Design a protein around this ligand. Structure first.
Ligand SMILES: Cc1cc2nc3c(=O)[nH]c(=O)nc-3n(C[C@H](O)[C@H](O)[C@H](O)COP(=O)(O)OP(=O)(O)OC[C@H]3O[C@@H](n4cnc5c(N)ncnc54)[C@H](O)[C@@H]3O)c2cc1C
Ligand SMILES: Cc1cc2nc3c(=O)[nH]c(=O)nc-3n(C[C@H](O)[C@H](O)[C@H](O)COP(=O)(O)OP(=O)(O)OC[C@H]3O[C@@H](n4cnc5c(N)ncnc54)[C@H](O)[C@@H]3O)c2cc1C
Ligand SMILES: Cc1cc2nc3c(=O)[nH]c(=O)nc-3n(C[C@H](O)[C@H](O)[C@H](O)COP(=O)(O)OP(=O)(O)OC[C@H]3O[C@@H](n4cnc5c(N)ncnc54)[C@H](O)[C@@H]3O)c2cc1C
Ligand SMILES: Cc1ncc(C[n+]2c([C@@](C)(O)C(=O)O)sc(CCOP(=O)(O)OP(=O)(O)O)c2C)c(N)n1
Ligand SMILES: Cc1ncc(C[n+]2c([C@@](C)(O)C(=O)O)sc(CCOP(=O)(O)OP(=O)(O)O)c2C)c(N)n1
Ligand SMILES: Cc1ncc(C[n+]2c([C@@](C)(O)C(=O)O)sc(CCOP(=O)(O)OP(=O)(O)O)c2C)c(N)n1
Ligand SMILES: [Mg+2]
Ligand SMILES: [Mg+2]
Ligand SMILES: [Mg+2]
Ligand code: NA
Lengths: 585, 585, 585
């Protein structure tokens, strides 16, 4: 006959298949809390220790599963705490619903306690941003919010006056539209455009295929096209793992979270096939200034010819289009361009392996990641924070299509390691989950290590303790006239932090310590979370964007200094391999 | 070697195929003006007399052609005057680019003359909203604005500090992505879903097909499905004309800008096929409260199950899906439901004809519209203002797929009549164009009758002068307890207004005056604009949402009063026709 | 026992002393209309023909009387039409309450007709910006809005769902805080600071007192300080009339809406007393680049040292501080600086008189303004539009403390002439009221000439018809490389426009026609509005910011061209007068 409006709201969430949601209660959201409390069997409330972690974990849920993440915050400070997670969801274009507490409608606009007009707070971040003002339409407003968040791939925010969810509404009127939800059936890729794009790619002397995460369903086709046509592959950083890292012609990514071969090869390429890619450094880094023909495949019209003047842009699904290309091409014999890139990749991997394979001495980030590799299951998920770890994990993690890795790709909020791992373990209780975080990032969300303990989420946390914002210190080295500032700080012993939240932990500062500590951690994480605090050196990782290796481009003194600093004595510039196989710059 | 950034910006507009744009100059936008001035042979600046008319005409350009409309306003009050046209573009989801003047970067944030932070002004209306801060990237920002406005079917606003377009930039770096433009992919109907939909539709006892402008490409399929299956058709008001008005099973539209047979049939229907339709009155009017099964076809996932819980929902193009249904059905015999509706339509149309066919006496809106019909070419375009005219034009205009009509569908801003006709005549100089406007709406944008004169745009302007806001008077009649207020006002003689802007004009107040005046207007408008000021009675048009004709539902006295007031003695309720064919109400 | 919330809201407006308010009704605001209708004996609704005129008139009410202006617009386009008047109120810092219609709370967030989240629309313009959600608190929210608009000298906006004002609330709980209202405290000048200020001012070789409207209560003190100390006076344009224009050491205003002696003297001054002044051109025009000492008196701490570094700054009321200075000084002898400026003023005024005193020939703006002077009562009020008219009225109107004049000072929105005069005549039915407007600005709000007729408001409207946006043509002349664009347009005959709204009118195009036409207008306006359409030449008024008269600074040829164009053969540069009295430039 009647149902509480709050109970109907929870039933809307359940209809859309929301498994878990995050937040911290307050008087202004206690009626939504009351409805969740009656529904503990069907929907799992996760009490976090800071609301930003709830918002970042909701974004991560959607990154991992493609299903909407849900978080909430009480009126005022609860909701404003969500912001770093909500901006992450907006910039990484994933569906998130955020519920915001509000004072009851009888007290709104009275300038009462923690009471303000909350609608303008969320106007910028949100695709949909409304204050509910009626109980009977509240389930519809929640359903609308969800449907829009999915359709528009972003954040829907609903401010809820706390009186509304306690009002009775007719039991028979409300519904959810989850039952209507589907994905579109697309026509086949434009045949004549695909044929023309293929001819241009094949006519090139120095082709590259450069994909981003829009190509996530197309790993098989990418690797087969590469092998068949003898065309090296490079990707955006987040697209690492779509093609296995072990693939001999995967060059890595460009710019700074980057690998030497991709940077060098891109500078030489005459034709680039840019697929499912919205690389934000295209223009500012002049990435394609030497490219003769630029070909694109993207599913979004707003991206067509966005990043560079484009000769042919096909509006289509990446996988369907790459399959259609593969269907019209056949074997090409090895070329000097292919052989030069393969040799360059081999030389680069030997460099990385030399860093990883040190067996004793002062601990560096490189041996830490090798120790991760050694205990990693083939389908492990990595939640990665923001800083040098993106660069180091990008180079050292050995990923395949069976893995997932997530970070804050574009907003790049520090603190995401812990919440992304919480979300990963909640969605995939049977998969191994790592949190790889620098000390600056880990410290911003450290309190929510307690959330892993409280919910028995067996995350393997690895904190990279350099006592620096290393990423920023290296930037200051490059740009700043005056001394380093704000980038070197006091130690925090995260093994003691972990102990304080009742999580087993280790602290290591020597390479020879790694094998046994990581073996213990692997075993602990069969049942409980664990943390390893790795005390690492302040060595700057090799800057792929500032290579000094080529005699024709850099002075002998600069090359000598670069080789010394970066332990890079055995690295050769691409030009050495180009010359070897009969090509010039 | 170099080009002025302003010249490059105009070249971007040209590459995107912008033929004409609107605005009023100011110091804060004179560098864009300077670039326009050099380009006057390739792109055509239309100087309006109020910037809202420029924004409304830009919206109407896009409604009519699907090509982005372009407008501008100077810093401060120029831009703020755009708002009603920009909101019209957002709510009617058509692409519009708005350029806003701003003080030079050397004077921004100094609190100088007409200088303010302009970005927050446009944040709500705009899909994309940026202040340009660099000359070299300015062409890209404009390119970005256009590509987004198209992809997202909405408003892009760029605030341009006046110094930037007078700066030299490299001639060879800037580009437009117009060459890469594509319209969004059209998703295909799932065959099994279409089969299930077809079976539910065929099993219905009282089916209706209820379409909106999303079905504008599917008029043939809608009419053929209706004839073949013996299923009546109804539409949203804006979808009038997709199927010819003369089609005998076209019921009209529901709610208030509505036709009696559509409201009556919808209340009785057991199954609705809701296609390309976002009827905003669905929930508030409880349109579908007694509908057993609800079948939806829409291209936009945000719409699926939005207006009612769906039994079958198809995420696909309207014409593809309707063709798929038509392909799997064959001729059905007549049914009681079908005959009942056909008879109801005949009775209704005879009513409207009786109004139109009066030959002498006090002029009413009905005969004015008959006089429009009599001079209207088969492919005439109608720009319609907001008020009683929407209801009257909806009932009386005899439209076919060959016509176009536009109004402000959802924001419903008064004043659009004049600008929409300006845009119509610019886009279709060889087609007859009407502006049909009430006196309230015509008053709001009356100065831009001067723009039709200045640009020699032969619009036939027809003003319905009731000396009222009739639409609002009728609402106050229905809801207010106290006397009418603000709805009856002083006469404006629009023939004298027209004389003042140097436009030929006539004023009529008797039915017998119409044939000769309209013939003269038809002739004048072969070369120049003309205005007819029609002084009409204050008769209220029949409220299709408040019918008093059925003695099972209304008192004898209310029926009698309704018949007398609305000259509706010969109208019968649908129940009469339902009973004739053996169906109960 | 109970009262309708809408009735209580109107009672709040009455308690606050609101005599009249403006707007246009709509369904979304009909419950406020219903309450107004019952209260028509105590509060007076003015129905305008476009809501921007209602907002601009509300702003002008507050400019004229200091009492909050009140306007409203229906949901969506009604409210958005308010924007230019609301921005005018914000930038001119006057209290205005705007009520915005909204759909009932049962239909909000359902995406129904003309229904949207309206709160973000007003967030930028408004000091206070809330959507009401409860009937019982609605009177308080309106009370809060008014008290804030006053205290903060800005715009308060309340969006009101239409259901709320038709709800019953307890008769005894609501109140207005009008009874508790007070204006902000007037801070007192520090005696030692005033002494230091006085000594710096007296030690100056070339002193100026430069005041704005913050000194509107201190005209007597300004004129007496000037006479006693032999210090010339200059003002912002809006501060014209605070000291009678006939005062022989009044230099006028600087920059462009400016008088030659003010620009010349300011460039030479060593000490400026800057009082009640927020001149927005100070930094951008480098007004004070050669000023040795800068002395400031202002009531607002946000202004102190804003426009230039301060040597002495006094946070105090202008009149109290000026009286304190005057109290500690005595008569000073004449100085070379004083005589030089007095002679410069005489030469300038003889120039303006030579323009005014033409008796026959092609009509220019100058003689029109002389004709206004000749029929103007000593306490006439001038509502001035935006464009050349600001410059011309600034030079030619002969104002005293008995006059008022208003325009849009800082937002500078065109169209204010008509509404400002409507507001003037409502507030001062016994005072003569002029609307002085260019053709561009008069065009924008021309429909509301009907409002002067409807309410029998005997405004003397004077339109300056140059068939140009003259102000902008002159800017393009100064800055643009290519031909003029968008600044010359087609004639509108405003006497025919006037005839169309049933207002008596005249059109003149010769100097000799003025005396009789203006005498007739003076007489007509004893009882009814009247319009004079003055067809004027396209002569550019003398640019006080681009003087070419001094042979030490300009070529002989530029001087000759300047004299001929501006009929300025008898003008001398200030250096002539400086040299006469033994001072060098
Ligand atoms: C500290 C830090 C530093 C970083 N620096 C770098 C760096 O140096 N190098 C680097 O590479 N990255 C770097 N990034 C990541 C970077 O900011 C961008 O997020 C990333 O490069 C963009 O990757 P993308 O194009 O794969 O993803 P997105 O930006 O999400 O783009 C996806 C694209 O694919 C399209 N798409 C989606 N689905 C389909 C489909 N089915 N078919 C076709 N197209 C589809 C979309 O329309 C879009 O254009 C860094 C991140 C961090 C945290
Ligand atoms: C004064 C006034 C009063 C009004 N009152 C009424 C009234 O009483 N009755 C009335 O009917 N209207 C009325 N309106 C118009 C009304 O507000 C709505 O705008 C209208 O009913 C919605 O029409 P629609 O669904 O055709 O258009 P839209 O709202 O534009 O929706 C079109 C739909 O089609 C979908 N679509 C687009 N392309 C495709 C495709 N290729 N295939 C499938 N789907 C597609 C879109 O996703 C969208 O859902 C009034 C207007 C005015 C000015
Ligand atoms: C088309 C056009 C062009 C214009 N160009 C010019 C131009 O060339 N030249 C020009 O002069 N103007 C021009 N303006 C007007 C200009 O934009 C500014 O509005 C004006 O110069 C500022 O005047 P003001 O300082 O008197 O007023 P405001 O900006 O309102 O400032 C008043 C000051 O007085 C202070 N105050 C208030 N009360 C007191 C008190 N009791 N005691 C002490 N201080 C107090 C306030 O805090 C404030 O600082 C133009 C206007 C238009 C429409
Ligand atoms: C919340 C927050 N605060 C600051 C930053 C800036 N910021 C970064 C970037 C990528 O945005 C950047 O500026 O280049 S990276 C970074 C340092 C990360 O320090 P960590 O100790 O976590 O990582 P290491 O680099 O391994 O030392 C900071 C502070 C950020 N990204 N997020
Ligand atoms: C710019 C503006 N201002 C006010 C309105 C409100 N409004 C209308 C609706 C549909 O929005 C409504 O409220 O129902 S309809 C309307 C009256 C239009 O009066 P007209 O004289 O033009 O038409 P008639 O109804 O033929 O008299 C007004 C003022 C509006 N739509 N746009
Ligand atoms: C609503 C609106 N639109 C445009 C403008 C720009 N604008 C002006 C300024 C002061 O803002 C300026 O840019 O310098 S002045 C101006 C011209 C006014 O032309 P008129 O015909 O009314 O006056 P004359 O100068 O006498 O011809 C315009 C269009 C403006 N102020 N307000
Ligand atoms: Mg660190
Ligand atoms: Mg009317
Ligand atoms: Mg003019
Ligand atoms: Na107007």
């Amino acid at each position: 006959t009647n149902i509480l409006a709050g109970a109907a709201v929870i039933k809307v969430l359940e209809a859309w298949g929301v498994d878990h949601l995050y937040g911290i209660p307050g008087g202004s959201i206690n009626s939504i809390m009351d409805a969740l409390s009656a529904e503990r069997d069907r929907i799992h409330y996760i009490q976090v220790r800071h609301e930003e972690v709830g918002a970042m974990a909701a974004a991560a849920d959607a990154k991992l599963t493609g299903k909407i993440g849900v978080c909430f915050g009480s009126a005022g400070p609860g909701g404003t705490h969500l912001m770093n997670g909500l901006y992450d969801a907006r910039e990484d274009h994933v569906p998130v619903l955020a519920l915001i507490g509000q004072f009851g409608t009888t007290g709104m606009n009275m300038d009462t306690f923690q009471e303000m007009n909350e609608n303008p707070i969320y106007a910028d971040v949100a695709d949909y941003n409304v204050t509910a003002v009626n109980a009977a339409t509240l389930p519809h407003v929640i359903d609308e919010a969800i449907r829009r968040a999915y359709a528009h791939q972003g954040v829907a925010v609903v401010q809820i006056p706390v009186d509304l969810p306690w009002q009775q509404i007719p039991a028979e009127d409300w519904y959810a539209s989850a039952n209507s939800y589907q994905t579109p059936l697309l026509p086949e890729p434009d045949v004549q455009a695909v044929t023309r794009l293929t001819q241009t790619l094949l006519a090139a002397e120095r082709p590259l295929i450069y994909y981003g995460i829009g190509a996530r369903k197309a790993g098989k086709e990418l690797e087969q096209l590469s092998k068949t046509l003898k065309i090296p592959l490079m990707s955006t950083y987040p697209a690492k793992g779509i093609v296995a890292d072990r693939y001999p012609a995967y060059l890595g990514s460009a710019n700074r979270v980057a690998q030497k071969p991709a940077n060098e090869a891109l500078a030489q390429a005459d034709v680039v096939l840019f697929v499912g890619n919205n690389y934000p450094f295209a223009e500012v880094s002049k990435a394609f200034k030497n490219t003769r023909y630029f070909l694109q495949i993207d599913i979004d019209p707003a991206k067509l010819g966005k990043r560079h003047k484009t000769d042919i842009a096909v509006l289509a699904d990446a996988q369907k289009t790459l399959a259609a290309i593969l269907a019209q091409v056949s074997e090409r014999e090895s070329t000097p361009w292919w052989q030069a890139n393969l040799a360059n990749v081999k030389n680069w991997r030997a460099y990385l392996a030399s860093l990883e394979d040190k067996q004793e001495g002062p601990l560096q980030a490189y041996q830490v990641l090798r120790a991760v590799n050694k205990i990693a299951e083939p389908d492990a998920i990595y939640s990665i924070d923001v800083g040098d770890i993106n660069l180091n994990a990008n180079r050292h993690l050995k990923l395949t299509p069976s893995n997932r890795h997530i970070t804050s790709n574009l907003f790049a909020t520090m603190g995401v390691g812990i919440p992304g791992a919480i979300a990963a373990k909640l969605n995939y209780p049977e998969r191994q989950v790592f949190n790889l975080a620098g000390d600056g990032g880990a410290s911003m969300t450290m309190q929510d290590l307690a959330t892993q303990v409280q919910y028995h989420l067996p995350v393997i946390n690895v904190v990279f303790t350099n006592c620096q914002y290393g990423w920023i210190k290296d930037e200051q080295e490059d740009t700043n006239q005056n001394d380093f500032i704000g980038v070197e700080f006091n130690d925090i012993d995260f093994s003691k932090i972990a102990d304080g939240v009742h999580m087993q932990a280790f602290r290591v500062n020597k390479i020879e310590q790694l094998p046994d500590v990581f073996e213990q951690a692997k075993a602990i994480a069969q049942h409980e979370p664990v943390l390893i605090d790795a005390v690492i050196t302040g060595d700057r990782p090799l800057p792929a964007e500032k290579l000094r290796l080529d005699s024709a481009m850099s002075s002998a003194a600069d090359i000598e200094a670069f080789k010394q600093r970066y332990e890079a004595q055995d690295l050769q510039p691409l030009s050495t391999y180009l010359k070897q196989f009969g090509l010039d710059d």
